Symmetry: C2
Subunit: 39 residues, 2 copies
Amino acid sequence: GSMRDKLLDFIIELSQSSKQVVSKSYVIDRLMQVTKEDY
Amino acid sequence: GSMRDKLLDFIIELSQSSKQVVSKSYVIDRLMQVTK
């Protein structure tokens, strides 16, 4: 659902960039946003 | 559930790596595997 859509949007964000390497800290930050829940 | 677990696993893997930048194609491939 929502998490999967957020994951796909992050994949699109990576795919649309011309960069060949990306900041690891940025990837981690974004994935923590993708997985964030409310408890 | 499982998608969250798999992404947490990937976050932990990245966190244990000494790399500061990583292959974008590698990240995309790993994340695409999770979308299945």
